[PDB]
Amino acid sequence: NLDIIGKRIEKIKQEHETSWHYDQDHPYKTWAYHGSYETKQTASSMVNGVVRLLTKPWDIIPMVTQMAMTFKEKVDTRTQEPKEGTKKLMKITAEWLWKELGKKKTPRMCTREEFTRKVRSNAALGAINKWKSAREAVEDSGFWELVDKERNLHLEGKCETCVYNMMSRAIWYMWLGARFLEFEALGFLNEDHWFSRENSLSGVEGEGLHKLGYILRDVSKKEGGAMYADDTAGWDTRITLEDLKNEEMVTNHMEGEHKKLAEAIFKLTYQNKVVRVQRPTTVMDIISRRDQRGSGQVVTYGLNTFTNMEAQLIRQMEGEGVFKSIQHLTVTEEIAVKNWLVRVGRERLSRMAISGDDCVVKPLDDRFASALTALNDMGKVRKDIQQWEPSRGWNDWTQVPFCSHHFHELIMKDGRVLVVPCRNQDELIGRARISQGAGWSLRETACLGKSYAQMWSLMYFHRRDLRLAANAICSAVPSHWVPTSRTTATHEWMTTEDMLTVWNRVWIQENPWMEDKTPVESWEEIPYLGKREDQWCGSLIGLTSRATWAKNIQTAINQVRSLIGNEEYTDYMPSMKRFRR
Ligand SMILES: CS(=O)(=O)NC1CCCC1
Ligand SMILES: [Zn+2]
Ligand SMILES: [Zn+2]
Numbered sequence: 001n002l003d004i005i006g007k008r009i010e011k012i013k014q015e016h017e018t019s020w021h022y023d024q025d026h027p028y029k030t031w032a033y034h035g036s037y038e039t040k041q042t043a044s045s046m047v048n049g050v051v052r053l054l055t056k057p058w059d060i061i062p063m064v065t066q067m068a069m070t071f072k073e074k075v076d077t078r079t080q081e082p083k084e085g086t087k088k089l090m091k092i093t094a095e096w097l098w099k100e101l102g103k104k105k106t107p108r109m110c111t112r113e114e115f116t117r118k119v120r121s122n123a124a125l126g127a128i129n130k131w132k133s134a135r136e137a138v139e140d141s142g143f144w145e146l147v148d149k150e151r152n153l154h155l156e157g158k159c160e161t162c163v164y165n166m167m168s169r170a171i172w173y174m175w176l177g178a179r180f181l182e183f184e185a186l187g188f189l190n191e192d193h194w195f196s197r198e199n200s201l202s203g204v205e206g207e208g209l210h211k212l213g214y215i216l217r218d219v220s221k222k223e224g225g226a227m228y229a230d231d232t233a234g235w236d237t238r239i240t241l242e243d244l245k246n247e248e249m250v251t252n253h254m255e256g257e258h259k260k261l262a263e264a265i266f267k268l269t270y271q272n273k274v275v276r277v278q279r280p281t282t283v284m285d286i287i288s289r290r291d292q293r294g295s296g297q298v299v300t301y302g303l304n305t306f307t308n309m310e311a312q313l314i315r316q317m318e319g320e321g322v323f324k325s326i327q328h329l330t331v332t333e334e335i336a337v338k339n340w341l342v343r344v345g346r347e348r349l350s351r352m353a354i355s356g357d358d359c360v361v362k363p364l365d366d367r368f369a370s371a372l373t374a375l376n377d378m379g380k381v382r383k384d385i386q387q388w389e390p391s392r393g394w395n396d397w398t399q400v401p402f403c404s405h406h407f408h409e410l411i412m413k414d415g416r417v418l419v420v421p422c423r424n425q426d427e428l429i430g431r432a433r434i435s436q437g438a439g440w441s442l443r444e445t446a447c448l449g450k451s452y453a454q455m456w457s458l459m460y461f462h463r464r465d466l467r468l469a470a471n472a473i474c475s476a477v478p479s480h481w482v483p484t485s486r487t488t489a490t491h492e493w494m495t496t497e498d499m500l501t502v503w504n505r506v507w508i509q510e511n512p513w514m515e516d517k518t519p520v521e522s523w524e525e526i527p528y529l530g531k532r533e534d535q536w537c538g539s540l541i542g543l544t545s546r547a548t549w550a551k552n553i554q555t556a557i558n559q560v561r562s563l564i565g566n567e568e569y570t571d572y573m574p575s576m577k578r579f580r581r
Contacts, residue, residue, distance in 0.1 A: 001032075004267070005288050007160050008274045009034050012286055023283065030078045031275075031287035039284045044070065046435045050449035053563075054472045054556050057545040058429050067430035074234045075170055079291065079379040085326040086377045087242055089317070089337060093310045094246035096341045100349075101194050101306075102253045109258045110187030112144070115180050124487040125183075126297060127176040128165060134176050147177045154181065154264035155257070162268060164275040164294055168234055172275065172294045182269070182296050185262040189250075189302035201349035202309045204403075205302070208490040209459050210506055213407030213419035214513045215353055216360060216397045222351055225366035226393020227400045231383040235304065235357035236293035238379040244271050244291065246310065247303045270295060304356035309349065312361050313341075315375050316348050319368035326373050353402060360402050369393060410462055412527050416516055418507060420462050422529075425538030428460060429469075437486055444484060446564060449473050451483035454493035458506060462529050464541050471572040472553050474499070476560035478567040500575075523575040550578070 002009070013020050016037035023036045047068050058064040082090070119125065119134045131137040150161050162181065164172040174182075189195070195203035197215065204215060220227065232238060248266035251259055273294050277285045293300055317323060322340045323333045353360045361368065370390040381387065394400045398407055404427075410418045432452035435445065453473035456466040483494055492506050493499075503526065504519045520526060528534065531541060540546035549556070553573060561569055573579035 004159070004272045005274050007158060008163055009286060009288075011160055012037075012163070012274075012276070016284075023285075025281070026285065027279070028076060028285070028287055030076050031289050034286045034288065036279075036283040036285055038282075039278065040282045041278075043437065046437075046440070048433055048435045048445055048449055048452075050446050050476065050560055051432045051452060051473065053560050054449075054476060055429055055433065055469055056556065057540055057543065057549045058426075058433075060545070061426060063424075063426035064430040064433065067427075068434055071168060071234075072170075074168070074237050075166075075292070077237060079238055079240050082240065082242055082377050082379070083326045083328075085323070085329045086374055088329040088334065089314050089323065089326070089374060090242060090246055090310060090378065092334065092337050093313055093341070094249055094306075096338070096345060097306065097310055097313075098249050098253060100345070101200055104199060105188075105192055105194055107250065107254045107258065107262075108188050108192070109185070109261065110183050110191055112180075114187070114191065115183055118183075119176075122486065122488055124297060125176070125179050126171060126173045127179050128173055137176050143177065147180055150177060150181060151261070154268065155260055157264065157267070159264070159268040162274075164273055166275055166277040170236065171297070174296075178269070179296055181261070182265055182299060185258070185265045186250075186295075186299045186302075190298045195302055195305045200305070200309065201346055202312075202352040202354040203305055204353055204355050205305070206490065208492065208506070209403070209405065209421045210492075210511075212353070212403055212405065213421060214511075216400055216402060216407055217409070217419055219351060219353060219360065219362050220397035222362050224351065224362045224364050225368060226362075226395060227397060228361045228363065228368060228391050228393045229359065229400050229402065230385075230391050232357055232380050233383040235308075235380075236300070238381065239291060239293040239307065240379055241271065241291045243307050243378075247306060301356045305354055308354050308357060308359055309352065311375065311378055311380050312352055312354065312359055313345070313348055314378070315368065315371055316351070316361070316363055318371035318374050319363055319365070321367075326377050355403050358403055360400055366393065408462065408529060408533070410527050410529065413525065414518075416514060418462075418527070419513070421459050422463070422537055425463055425465060427538075428456070428463075428466060432456075442564060443481065446477045446560075447481050447484040450477045450481065451485055451494060453477075454483055454495070454499055454502075457499040458493045458503060461503070461523075461526055462534075463537070463539065464528055464531075464534055465539050465546065467523075467528070468550055468553065468576065471575060472557055475569065475572045476557045476564070477569075478564065479570040480568065524577055524580075553579075 013035065019037035020035055026033045045068055116138045119138045125134065127134055131140060131143070137143040153160055162174060162178040164174060166172060193199060193206055195205035197203055197207060204212060207215065244266070251262045251266065254262055271290055273289055275287050277287060279285050293304070295303065317337060317340060322337055323329060351362045372388060376387055382391070398409060400406065405421045405423050408420050408422055410420050412418060435448060450473060453470040456470040460466040480496065482496055492502055495502060500523060508514055508517055508519060529537065534541055
C-alpha cells in the first residue's frame with residue numbers, strides 16, 4: 001500500500017496545497033481514495049465533409065447519421081480471489097506459455113532512439129505541462145533528465161511521477177516520460193512480435209485484416225467441435241492481481257538492468273496504480289487500486305493476448321477432463337496438466353485465434369461449451385449469457401465474429417479463392433464520415449477521406465457501394481495528395497502507389513494461400529459478393545436513392561473538386577464496367 005504509492009501521493013498533494021481536502025461525499029467503493037483538489041476543463045466527433053458529400057444516400061440512414069452525434073460503474077466493481085486449484089492452473093500454464101513464447105525470442109530494452117522515431121511518425125502513445133507536444137519534449141535534454149531521475153528511482157525500487165489520468169472503454173493517459181519507461185521495459189513484446197502467429201501459434205499480431213479470414217478457415221480445417229467466440233464482459237476490469245503476477249513472470253526471462261526496470265513497471269505502476277479522475281461535483285480525485293488493466297494500449301494488447309491464451313488453454317483442459325475440480329489440484333493433477341501442456345499444448349494453441357480480449361477457439365469437441373468453472377472463477381465472465389448456460393458455438397467459419405468482422409469465401413471468375421473481411425456497411429460508412437480533433441484544413445480532411453477510400457479498395461472491394469464510393473473519393477481528391485491519419489493490423493492502403501498494384505501485391509503476390517501468382521490486369525477481374533449477400537451485409541443496391549447517386553456520381557465528384565479548387569485530379573470511375581462507355 002502507501003509505502004509504494006505514498007511518494008506519488010505526497011508529490012501531488014504539495015502542488016495543490018492551496019486546494020487539498022479529504023472529501024467525505026466521495027463516490028468510490030472499490031478504489032482507495034486519498035484526497036481532492038481544484039481544476040476546470042472537459043473532444044467530440046466532427047464530420048468529414050469530403051466523405052459525407054460523396055455518400056449522399058446515407059444522409060437519411062439513422063444507423064450512419066447517429067454515429068456522428070453525442071461504463072464508469074464497471075471501473076468501480078471488484079473481482080473475487082480465484083480458488084487455490086484455479087491459481088495453480090494459471091501459474092503452471094503461465095510459466096509454460098512464457099517459456100514457449102521465449103524459445104525463439106530474446107527479451108531486450110527498447111531505446112530512446114526507437115521511442116523518438118515512433119513519436120516523430122504519429123503513434124497513439126496516450127501522453128498529456130512544459131512542452132507543447134511529445135515531438136518537442138523528445139528533442140529537449142531537460143525531458144531526458146526527468147526520465148533519468150524517475151529511471152534511477154525505479155532501479156532503487158521506488159516511483160514519484162508514474163501517475164494515471166482517466167478519460168465499455170477507459171484510456172489511462174500518463175506523461176510521456178512514464179510512457180518511455182513503460183516502452184523501454186516492455187516494448188519488446190510488440191516491437192519483436194512475440195504475439196505473431198509464427199511465434200505464439202494462437203496470436204495474430206501483425207496480421208492484416210486480409211489474413212484473418214484465411215487464419216479462421218485454417219482453424220476450421222482441424223477435427224473438433226463448433227467454433228466458440230465468447231466475448232468477456234469488460235475484460236480490462238476483470239484482470240485480477242493473480243493475472244498481473246502471472247504476466248510479471250516474463251521478467252524471469254530477462255537479466256541485468258532490463259530485469260530490474262521491468263520488475264519496477266510491474267510492481268510500481270501495474271500492481272499498484274495512482275489515478276487522477278475529473279469529478280463534476282470540478283475537483284480532481286486521487287485514487288489507487290492494485291488490480292484491473294491500466295498500461296499503455298500497446299502493452300495492454302500483448303498482456304491481454306497472453307492472459308486470454310492462458311485462460312482459453314485452461315478452458316480447453318477443463319473440457320478434456322485434465323482436472324476434475326478448481327477447489328484443489330492434487331499432486332498428480334499438477335503432473336497431468338504439465339504433461340498435457342508438453343504433449344499437446346502447441347497443438348491446442350493452433351486451435352485458437354486470439355487478438356487481445358477477442359478469441360475464437362475450435363476445441364477437440366463440444367464438452368468445451370459447458371466447461372465454465374475455471375473461466376467463471378478466473379473472473380472472465382461471458383457477455384450476454386447466464387453464468388452457467390453453455391456457450392453457443394458456430395458451425396461455419398464464415399459466420400464466426402472476430403475483430404468486429406466476419407469473413408466471406410469469394411471465387412474469382414478465374415477460379416482462384418479470396419477470403420475477404422466484411423462488416424455491416426452502415427458501420428463502415430458511418431466511421432469514414434467521422435474525424436477526431438480540431439484545426440483540420442480542407443486538404444487534411446480530403447487526405448483522411450482518401451485513406452478510408454484506399455482501405456475500402458483493398459479490404460472491402462467486394463461491396464458494390466464501397467468500391468463505387470472509394471473510386472469517387474479518389475477521383476475527387478488530387479491524385480498526388482498523400483493519405484493521412486492522426487491515430488495509426490498492417491496499413492497497406494497508406495501510400496500513393498496505384499491501388500491495383502497494391503491489390504496485386506496483397507491478395508496475389510504476398511498471399512501464402514494463393515498458389516497461382518498470375519497478376520490481375522484490371523479491377524473488372526476482381527469479384528463482388530453475390531447481390532443478395534451484399535444487401536444482407538447492408539448494401540443499398542436496389543434502392544432509388546442509390547441508383548440516382550451511382551448514375552449522377554460525376555456531379556458529386558465535381559462538387560468536391562470545385563470546393564478543393566484547381567488541382568490535378570484523375571478520373572477513376574471508368575475502372576468500373578458501368579462508367580467504361
Ligand atoms: C507505452 S506502450 O509501450 O504501450 N506504447 C508505446 C509508446 C510509444 C510507442 C508505443
Ligand atoms: Zn515511476
Ligand atoms: Zn458480409
